[PDB]
Design an enzyme around this catalytic site. Structure first.
Site, PDB file in Angstrom:
ATOM      1  N   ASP A  19      28.293  40.581  35.609  1.00 12.73           N
ATOM      2  CA  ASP A  19      28.243  39.657  34.481  1.00 12.73           C
ATOM      3  C   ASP A  19      27.068  39.715  33.781  1.00 12.73           C
ATOM      4  OD1 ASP A  19      29.270  37.911  32.785  1.00 12.73           O
ATOM      5  OD2 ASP A  19      30.086  36.585  34.324  1.00 12.73           O
TER       6      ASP A  19
ATOM      7  N   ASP B 162      22.904  33.873  34.883  1.00 14.19           N
ATOM      8  CA  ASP B 162      23.980  33.411  35.176  1.00 14.19           C
ATOM      9  C   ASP B 162      24.234  33.771  36.631  1.00 14.19           C
ATOM     10  OD1 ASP B 162      27.573  33.167  34.176  1.00 14.19           O
ATOM     11  OD2 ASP B 162      26.436  31.726  34.895  1.00 14.19           O
TER      12      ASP B 162
HETATM   13  N1  LIG Z   1      33.018  46.244  38.295  1.00  7.72           N
HETATM   14  C1  LIG Z   1      33.896  45.625  38.807  1.00  7.72           C
HETATM   15  N2  LIG Z   1      34.810  46.021  39.893  1.00  7.72           N
HETATM   16  C2  LIG Z   1      35.675  45.218  40.454  1.00  7.72           C
HETATM   17  N3  LIG Z   1      35.858  44.070  39.923  1.00  7.72           N
HETATM   18  C3  LIG Z   1      35.160  43.507  38.806  1.00  7.72           C
HETATM   19  C4  LIG Z   1      34.092  44.253  38.062  1.00  7.72           C
HETATM   20  N4  LIG Z   1      33.672  43.564  37.358  1.00  7.72           N
HETATM   21  C5  LIG Z   1      34.218  42.282  37.241  1.00  7.72           C
HETATM   22  N5  LIG Z   1      35.247  42.407  38.120  1.00  7.72           N
HETATM   23  C6  LIG Z   1      36.026  41.103  38.483  1.00  7.72           C
HETATM   24  O1  LIG Z   1      36.260  40.714  37.321  1.00  7.72           O
HETATM   25  C7  LIG Z   1      35.812  39.163  37.240  1.00  7.72           C
HETATM   26  C8  LIG Z   1      35.388  38.737  35.964  1.00  7.72           C
HETATM   27  O2  LIG Z   1      34.186  39.449  35.647  1.00  7.72           O
HETATM   28  P1  LIG Z   1      32.891  38.791  34.969  1.00  7.72           P
HETATM   29  O3  LIG Z   1      32.140  37.901  36.008  1.00  7.72           O
HETATM   30  O4  LIG Z   1      32.128  40.040  34.399  1.00  7.72           O
HETATM   31  O5  LIG Z   1      33.222  38.077  33.643  1.00  7.72           O
HETATM   32  P2  LIG Z   1      33.775  36.462  33.329  1.00  7.72           P
HETATM   33  O6  LIG Z   1      33.113  35.679  34.162  1.00  7.72           O
HETATM   34  O7  LIG Z   1      35.350  36.448  33.516  1.00  7.72           O
HETATM   35  O8  LIG Z   1      33.355  36.487  31.962  1.00  7.72           O
HETATM   36  P3  LIG Z   1      32.005  36.944  31.146  1.00  7.72           P
HETATM   37  O9  LIG Z   1      31.567  38.034  31.981  1.00  7.72           O
HETATM   38  O10 LIG Z   1      32.185  37.592  29.901  1.00  7.72           O
HETATM   39  O11 LIG Z   1      31.032  35.966  31.224  1.00  7.72           O
HETATM   40  C9  LIG Z   1      34.943  39.169  38.543  1.00  7.72           C
HETATM   41  O12 LIG Z   1      34.792  37.901  39.009  1.00  7.72           O
HETATM   42  C10 LIG Z   1      35.214  40.222  39.306  1.00  7.72           C
HETATM   43  O13 LIG Z   1      36.346  39.558  40.401  1.00  7.72           O
HETATM   44 MN   LIG Z   2      31.463  36.030  35.874  1.00  8.03          MN
END
Ligand SMILES: Nc1ncnc2c1ncn2[C@@H]1O[C@H](COP(=O)(O)OP(=O)(O)OP(=O)(O)O)[C@@H](O)[C@H]1O
Ligand SMILES: [Mn+2]
EC number: 2.7.11.1
Length: 245
Positions: A199, A183
């Site tokens: 992610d 992804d």
């Molecule tokens: N380690 C991190 N540090 C700072 N910001 C983060 C971090 N991890 C995620 N984020 C923020 O949170 C948002 C969402 O995270 P992530 O892409 O992991 O999950 P999602 O797309 O909302 O759902 P899923 O991961 O379960 O598919 C990211 O776009 C980023 O902006």
């Molecule tokens: Mn994501």
């Protein structure tokens, strides 16, 4: 269960004055989640839950101050709400609620794997049930922008350099971690002064039946995105560079 939530929110010190936070936490999390967060605080991992970073259909992400390996750190706290094609076929996992806990562990193990291989992902710290604690990417409790968030600010950066950073990280993931993100796109790549991949619950091992198909998709997403910023790339060249062919 509302009474339980409000109580833990008090114990966690998520206050009325902390903006919109208390209302967001109380709606997006559940009592048993906040219990796990409070056990993580008691154990010394979390010093203080902070602002809401993202609320999704699958996951919620929050800032925290915490402690890892004897020192204070900034944390991203990612919490999966309590998928299949990405679990089945991944033989690492011997197959509702339990499914979310495996997925959490999956993402944690993938972070660790990717990090050991030299891929730029957030340092993983610990997980427990549906909660994953990791390195906060950003500064002063502001998350680093994803590539989409960057937007046409990219035109002022070394886009080709950023592209090549992305490609190198995919190549390490493939050749050294033996994983495919699955992804990978501008929505899941962050940039401060280097790119980080995030992610990774869905990432699969090169043993997965679909690894190559997911990889080809990742590569096409990256070529598509960077084409909009002036970076000329060929699918065959990038794929071969990544796979060492
Ligand atoms: N380690 C991190 N540090 C700072 N910001 C983060 C971090 N991890 C995620 N984020 C923020 O949170 C948002 C969402 O995270 P992530 O892409 O992991 O999950 P999602 O797309 O909302 O759902 P899923 O991961 O379960 O598919 C990211 O776009 C980023 O902006
Ligand atoms: Mn994501």
């Amino acid at each position: 269960d509302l009474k339980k939530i409000e109580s833990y929110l008090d114990k966690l010190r998520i206050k009325e004055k902390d903006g919109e936070e208390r209302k967001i936490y109380a709606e997006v999390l559940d009592g048993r989640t906040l219990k796990t967060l409070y056990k993580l605080s008691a154990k010394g991992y979390i010093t203080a839950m902070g602002g809401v970073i993202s609320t999704g259909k699958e996951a919620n992400v929050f800032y925290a101050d915490g402690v890892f390996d004897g020192k204070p750190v900034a944390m991203a706290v990612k919490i999966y709400r309590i998928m299949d094609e990405y679990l089945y076929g991944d033989e690492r996992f011997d197959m509702p609620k339990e499914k979310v806990f495996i997925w959490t562990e999956k993402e944690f193990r993938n972070l660790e794997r990717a990090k050991e291989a030299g891929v730029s992902v957030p340092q993983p710290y610990t997980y427990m049930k549906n909660v994953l604690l990791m390195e906060f990417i950003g500064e002063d409790e502001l998350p680093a922008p994803t590539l989409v968030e960057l937007g046409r600010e990219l035109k002022e950066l070394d886009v080709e350099g950023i592209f090549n950073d992305v490609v190198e990280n995919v190549k390490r993931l493939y050749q050294e971690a033996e994983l495919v993100h699955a992804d990978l796109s501008e929505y899941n790549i962050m940039y401060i002064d280097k790119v980080y991949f995030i992610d990774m619950g869905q990432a699969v091992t090169l043993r997965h039946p679909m690894a190559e198909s997911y990889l080809e998709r990742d590569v096409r997403n990256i070529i598509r995105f960077f084409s909009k910023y002036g970076v000329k790339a060929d699918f065959e060249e990038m794929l071969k560079e990544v796979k060492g062919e």
